[PDB]
């Protein structure tokens, strides 16, 4: 988190991760369109010649303060086909919570498994353990006839009873349930004072 004492805001970074075309943009856009205009920034896309980043922030009005501070959530993803692994490494810098979005189609199951391993390795390369940070998994595209059962999704992707949410992102099914779950894990960590605290005088 980035705790800005001037604004009295705790800024938490939630990264949506998963294979290309699995539904990350759709999650972010659905959330963005169902967030109060007065609470949110612009929806921002940063494009290079190849890879892109999509993100926005918002300050939910329902949330109480944590020891005098409000919590602002920043949602980040690298959407679409990824050309540089470095892009997925960079998106994880400063992460506070992760949503892994799995594409439930059988044809994408190997891509899901590769992306989940890539997430664990890229986190570890920057000193994060996926087992020690707020993390939820979304089984997206439940509407498609080639979507594998939750049982098969879990056998392939979830061996630690990670909180799991079924989603159909374009219609919003499961989208807020997923976000609420990871946000609650992040907030619980903040309230208990868990994690490593660094004091900067910049
Ligand atoms: N049928 C179906 N299509 C989906 C679902 N979620 C995303 N899509 C479609 O899959 C494509 C890729 O989604 P997108 O969110 O851009 O993927 P990203 O690369 O992970 O950001 C788009 O055409 C979406 O409309 C879903 O739950 N069901």
Numbering used by the authors: 2 to 203
Sentences from the paper on this structure:
The localization of motility complexes, and thereby the direction of movement, is determined by an oscillatory system, which includes Mutual gliding motility A (MglA), a small Ras-like GTPase, and Mutual gliding motility B (MglB), its GTPase activating protein (GAP) as major components. Allosteric binding of the C-terminal helix (Ct-helix) of MxMglB on MxMglA facilitates nucleotide exchange.
All the residues of the small Ras-like GTPase fold as well as the C-terminal hexahistidine tag were modeled in the MxMglA structure. Though GDP was not added during protein purification or crystallization, the crystal structure of MxMglA contained GDP in the nucleotide-binding pocket. High-performance liquid chromatography (HPLC) analysis of the protein sample reconfirmed that the bound ligand is GDP. The purified MxMglA contained GDP bound to the active site pocket.
